CSV table of C-alpha atoms in Angstrom, one decimal:
chain,number,residue,atom,x,y,z
A,121,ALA,CA,-6.5,17.3,-12.3
A,122,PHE,CA,-7.9,14.0,-15.0
A,123,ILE,CA,-11.6,13.8,-14.0
A,124,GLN,CA,-12.1,9.8,-15.2
A,125,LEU,CA,-14.2,7.0,-14.6
A,126,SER,CA,-12.1,4.4,-12.9
A,127,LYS,CA,-12.4,1.1,-15.0
A,128,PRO,CA,-11.6,-2.5,-13.7
A,129,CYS,CA,-8.6,-4.7,-14.4
A,130,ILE,CA,-7.8,-8.2,-16.5
A,131,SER,CA,-9.8,-11.6,-15.0
A,132,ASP,CA,-8.3,-13.4,-12.1
A,133,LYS,CA,-7.9,-16.1,-15.2
A,134,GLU,CA,-5.0,-13.6,-16.2
A,135,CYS,CA,-4.3,-12.3,-12.7
A,136,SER,CA,-2.5,-15.5,-12.0
A,137,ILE,CA,0.7,-17.1,-12.1
A,138,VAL,CA,0.0,-18.0,-15.7
A,139,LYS,CA,1.3,-14.4,-16.3
A,140,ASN,CA,4.1,-14.6,-13.3
A,141,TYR,CA,2.1,-12.0,-11.1
A,142,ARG,CA,-0.3,-12.7,-8.7
A,143,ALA,CA,-3.1,-10.3,-7.5
A,144,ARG,CA,-6.9,-10.8,-6.5
A,145,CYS,CA,-9.4,-9.9,-9.0
A,146,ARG,CA,-12.9,-10.3,-8.3
A,147,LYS,CA,-15.8,-8.9,-10.3
A,148,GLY,CA,-13.4,-6.6,-12.1
A,149,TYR,CA,-11.9,-5.2,-8.9
A,150,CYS,CA,-8.0,-5.7,-8.4
A,151,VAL,CA,-6.3,-5.7,-5.3
A,152,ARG,CA,-2.8,-7.0,-5.0
A,153,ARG,CA,-3.1,-8.7,-1.2
A,154,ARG,CA,-0.9,-10.9,1.2
A,155,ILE,CA,-1.5,-14.4,2.6
A,156,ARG,CA,-0.7,-12.7,6.0
């Protein structure tokens, strides 16, 4: 096991289709959501 402190992801600005991707990023927390 590699005991490590988890770190957040890129900002919502970057988590948008600007980068062709689509994820929900809030306060650094990164979750790939569904519409339904």
